[PDB]
Design an enzyme around this catalytic site. Structure first.
Site, PDB file in Angstrom:
ATOM      1  N   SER A   1     -15.594  35.520  20.542  1.00 56.49           N
ATOM      2  CA  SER A   1     -15.646  35.283  19.103  1.00 56.49           C
ATOM      3  C   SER A   1     -14.242  35.355  18.514  1.00 56.49           C
ATOM      4  O   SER A   1     -13.283  35.708  19.211  1.00 56.49           O
ATOM      5  CB  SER A   1     -16.556  36.313  18.421  1.00 56.49           C
ATOM      6  OG  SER A   1     -17.926  35.983  18.588  1.00 56.49           O
TER       7      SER A   1
ATOM      8  N   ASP B   1      -2.326  45.979  18.285  1.00 56.24           N
ATOM      9  CA  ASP B   1      -3.771  45.726  18.247  1.00 56.24           C
ATOM     10  C   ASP B   1      -4.429  46.199  19.537  1.00 56.24           C
ATOM     11  O   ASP B   1      -5.292  45.536  20.105  1.00 56.24           O
ATOM     12  CB  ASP B   1      -4.117  44.259  17.939  1.00 56.24           C
ATOM     13  CG  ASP B   1      -5.609  44.032  17.779  1.00 56.24           C
ATOM     14  OD1 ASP B   1      -6.288  44.938  17.243  1.00 56.24           O
ATOM     15  OD2 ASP B   1      -6.107  42.960  18.203  1.00 56.24           O
TER      16      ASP B   1
END
Ligand code: B0R
Length: 268
Positions: free
Chosen positions: A18, A129
């Site tokens: 995704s 991240d």
């Protein structure tokens, strides 16, 4: 030299990936592979060279704890291909299938993840991240850190992950908040995930409130939700990794050291 994989060689299959940063497909190329197609359309050679440039960073990585980069693609689409990890990501284990690990394992997953970063940092790579979603878990024994690629390609072509963000990162202050210590804090957060099997700030329902508060250092993770079987100097280390000012954060060599120390202080 060149790692390009010509069209037709790769055989795309099942979908899982995704996000607008790219789509991940399970594949086949000299065995099971993972393919992250960059889900752009057909970008112009100023962008193509910038992709080639981000690859040049990936090939610098050769380490058991770093997800294995295997090759890039262009002619069907822009793509990065990696080893396929059987088993599920860390975020999945702790937070979706509620997997209770022995304390010995939890400490090990940490050790490996810390090991992975110390490497990345030695080869001058900032993950930017790191979160338990990007920490893949191979054959349910080995830590494989992914998604550290393509830092350039986020800014050149303009949510979530906020839990892992250090203050200076959270409050979108200057143009480069990302440091080694930035990554250490994000590590601190996974340390809190392991030791409490829980996401932080789960008792605050408004995101912007988190964001405002973390950035001003009014709200930090609740270290007292660590389980009892967790070591005493584990709390001390989380505290070190989670410091509000970035100077006070230890770098990975030292973190690693503290984990090895407490790890082989537990079975007896
Ligand atoms: C390794 C350096 C390249 S990068 O761009 O930092 N990361 C990068 C690049 C391409 C990918 F397909 C991926 C990736 O997520 N791969 C991936 C690999 N094996 C998996 N088993 N189960 C999954 O989930 C169901 C997987 C996801 C990736 F993490």
């Amino acid at each position: 030299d060149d790692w390009e994989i010509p069209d037709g060689q790769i055989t795309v299959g099942q979908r899982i990936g995704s996000g607008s940063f790219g789509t991940v497909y399970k594949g086949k190329w000299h065995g099971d592979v993972a393919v992250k197609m960059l889900n752009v359309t057909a970008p112009t050679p100023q962008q193509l060279q910038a992709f080639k440039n981000e690859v040049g960073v990936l090939r610098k990585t050769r380490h058991v704890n770093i997800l294995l980069f295997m090759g890039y693609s262009t002619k069907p689409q822009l793509a990065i291909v990696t080893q396929w990890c059987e088993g599920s990501s860390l975020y999945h284990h702790l937070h979706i299938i509620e997997t209770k690990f022995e304390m010995i394992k939890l400490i090990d997953i940490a050790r490996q993840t810390a090991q992975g970063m110390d490497y990345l940092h030695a080869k001058s790579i900032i993950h930017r991240d790191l979160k338990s979603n990007n920490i893949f878990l191979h054959e349910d024994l080995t830590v494989k850190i992914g998604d550290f690629g393509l830092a350039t390609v986020k800014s050149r072509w303009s949510s979530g992950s906020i839990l892992w963000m250090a203050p200076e990162v959270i409050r979108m202050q200057d143009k480069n908040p990302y440091s080694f210590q930035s990554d250490v804090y994000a590590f601190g957060i996974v340390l809190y995930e392991l030791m409490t099997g829980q996401l932080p700030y789960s008792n605050i329902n408004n995101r912007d409130q988190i964001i405002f508060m973390v950035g001003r250092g009014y709200l930090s993770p609740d270290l007292s939700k660590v389980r009892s079987n967790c070591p005493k100097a584990m709390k001390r280390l989380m505290a070190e990794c989670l410091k509000k000012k970035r100077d006070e954060r230890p770098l990975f060599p030292q973190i690693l050291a503290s984990i090895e120390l407490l790890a082989r202080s537990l079975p007896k």
